[PDB]
């Protein structure tokens, strides 16, 4: 693994979004079980005209 | 793995979106089980005219 | 793996969208089971005229 | 694997959309089981006149 | 694998759309099982006059 | 309406099964809607050698 | 309407099965709509040697 | 309406099963809506050799 | 309405099962809504050799 | 309305099961709403050889 | 109503533009009806230096 | 109502623009109805140096 | 109502702009109805140096 | 009402702009109704040095 | 009401701007209703050095 050398703007290994969202669960249910799950909107990155050049 | 050398703008290995969203689950259910799941909108990247050049 | 050398704009190995969305599940259900799943819109990339040149 | 050398704009190995969407599932159901699944619209790439040249 | 050398615009190995959409499933159902699946519109690429030259 | 007069066994106006099962619905759906419905077995009447004479 | 007068066994106006099963629906759907429906076996009447005489 | 007069066994206006099971619904849905419904087995009447004569 | 006069056993206007099970609902949903519903088995009447004569 | 006159056993207007089970609901939902509902088994009537004659 | 008496130029009761443009419509629509309407530019009067004096 | 008497130029009761533009509509719509309406630019009067004196 | 008597230029009761623009509408809508309306620019009067004196 | 008597220029009762712009509407909406309205710029009067004296 | 008598320039009862802009509306909305309204710039009067004296 080698990082970026150069660039007009800042070049980096930016991780904005990732991971596990309710994954790898081990559920054993009997009869009347309810497991609701809600995940809100995910906004990862540059928003509102960010990282602009003057 | 070798990173970017150069560019007019910042060249980098940017990861905006990824991962697991309710994957790899192990569910064993009996009789009347309910497992609802909702995932909101995913916005990954540059939004609103971001990373622009002046 | 060799990264980009150069370009007019920032050349990089950008990953905007990816991953698993409710994949690889192991479900064993008996009788009356309900497993609803909803995934919202996925917006990956550049939006609203992003990464433009002046 | 060799990256792009040069170009008028930023040449890179951009991955906008991909992955698994409810794939590779292992489901064994008995009697009255319901497994509904909805996937919203996927927008991957450049939208709204993005990555333009002035 | 060798990347693009040059071009008037940014030449890169861009992947806009791909992957598996409910593929490779292993389903064994008995009696009255329902497995509905809906996939929304997929928009991969450049939209709204993107990647234009001034 | 006049009921039964007599008989060797009990004569009556027995209603074992009836009604509406998801009938008269008013559904107006747009785009990707799923409305699954499952109704289990209906057993109406005399079962297991019922209402027998010694 | 006059009921039964007499008989060796019990004579009556027995209604075992009837009704509406997903009838008279008013559905107006647009684009990609799915409305699956399953009705299980209906067993109406006398079963297992019922209403026998000794 | 006149009830039963007589009989060897008890003659009556017995209602074992009936009613509405998810009927007359007024649903107006937009985009990705899921409304699953499961109804279990209905056992109405005499079971296990009931209402027998010695 | 006139009740039963007589009989070998007790003649009465017995209502074992009935009513509304999720009927007459007024649902107006937008975007990603899930309304799962499960109804268990209904056992109405005489079970296990009930109301027998010695 | 006139009740039962007589009988070998107790003749009465017995109501074992009835009512509304999540009926007549007025639900207006927006975006990602989940309303799961489970109703257990309903046992209405005479069970285990009840109301027998010696 | 009395007309103009005199003037340096021609005085008259000139009506250049007027009327009803899709007005007073009686529309009763059911389910998915579309009634688009476009009205082009209206140029009423004197244009290009008209009604000039030498 | 009395018209103009005199003037250096032509005095008259000129009506250039007026009327109803999609007014007084009676619309009763059910479910998914769309009634778009576009009205172009209205130019009423004297344009391009009209009604000038030499 | 009495008109103008005299003047250096033509004095008149000129109506350039007026009327109703989507007014007095009677709309009764149910569920998902859309009634968009666009009105273009209105230019009423004298433009481009009109009604000038030499 | 008496009109103008005299003046250096043409004195008149000029109405350039007026009327109703989406006024007096009677709207009764149920559930998800959208009624967007756009009115363009209104230019009423004398523009570009109009009604000038030489 | 008496009009102007005289003046160096044309004296008149000029109405440049007025009226109702989305006023007097009768709106009764239920649940999720949206009624956006945009009114553009209003320019009423004399612009660009109009009605000047030489």
Swiss-Prot record, chains A, B, C, D, E, F, G, H, I, J, K, L, M, N, O:
UniProt PTM comment: Sumoylated in exosomes, promoting miRNAs-binding.
Subcellular location: Nucleus; Nucleus, Nucleoplasm; Cytoplasm; Cytoplasmic granule
Residues with PTM Omega-N-methylarginine: 51
Consequence of substituting residue 21 to S: Impairs hydrogel-binding
Effect upon mutating residue 29 to S: Impairs hydrogel-binding
In-chain residues carrying the UniProt-annotated modification Phosphoserine: 50
Comment block on domains: The disordered region, when incubated at high concentration, is able to polymerize into labile, amyloid-like fibers and form cross-beta polymerization structures, probably driving the formation of hydrogels. In contrast to irreversible, pathogenic amyloids, the fibers polymerized from low complexity (LC) regions disassemble upon dilution. A number of evidence suggests that formation of cross-beta structures by LC regions mediate the formation of RNA granules, liquid-like droplets, and hydrogels.
Disease with which this protein is associated in UniProt: Inclusion body myopathy with early-onset Paget disease with or without frontotemporal dementia 2: An autosomal dominant disease characterized by disabling muscle weakness clinically resembling to limb girdle muscular dystrophy, osteolytic bone lesions consistent with Paget disease, and premature frontotemporal dementia. Clinical features show incomplete penetrance. Oculopharyngeal muscular dystrophy 2: An autosomal dominant, early-onset myopathy characterized by progressive muscle weakness, ptosis, ophthalmoplegia, dysphagia, and variable degrees of respiratory insufficiency.
Task performed by this protein: Heterogeneous nuclear ribonucleoprotein (hnRNP) that associates with nascent pre-mRNAs, packaging them into hnRNP particles. The hnRNP particle arrangement on nascent hnRNA is non-random and sequence-dependent and serves to condense and stabilize the transcripts and minimize tangling and knotting. Packaging plays a role in various processes such as transcription, pre-mRNA processing, RNA nuclear export, subcellular location, mRNA translation and stability of mature mRNAs. Forms hnRNP particles with at least 20 other different hnRNP and heterogeneous nuclear RNA in the nucleus.
Subunit text: Homodimer; dimerization is required for nucleocytoplasmic translocation. Identified in the spliceosome C complex. Identified in a IGF2BP1-dependent mRNP granule complex containing untranslated mRNAs. Interacts with IGF2BP1. Interacts with C9orf72. Interacts with DGCR8. Interacts with TARDBP. Interacts with CKAP5. Interacts with TBK1. Interacts with STING1. Interacts with SRC. Interacts with PPIA/CYPA. Interacts (via C-terminus) with FAM76B; the interaction results in retention of HNRNPA2B1 in the nucleus and inhibition of the NF-kappa-B-mediated inflammatory pathway.
Name assigned to this protein: Heterogeneous nuclear ribonucleoproteins A2/B1
Residues of the full protein shown: 275 to 328 of 353
């Amino acid at each position: 693994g080698y990082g970026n050398q150069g660039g007009g703007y800042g070049g980096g290994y930016d991780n904005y979004g990732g991971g596990n969202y309710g994954s790898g669960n081990y559920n054993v249910f009997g009869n009347y079980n309810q497991q609701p799950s809600n995940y809100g909107p995910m906004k990862s990155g540059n928003f509102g005209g960010s990282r602009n050049m003057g």
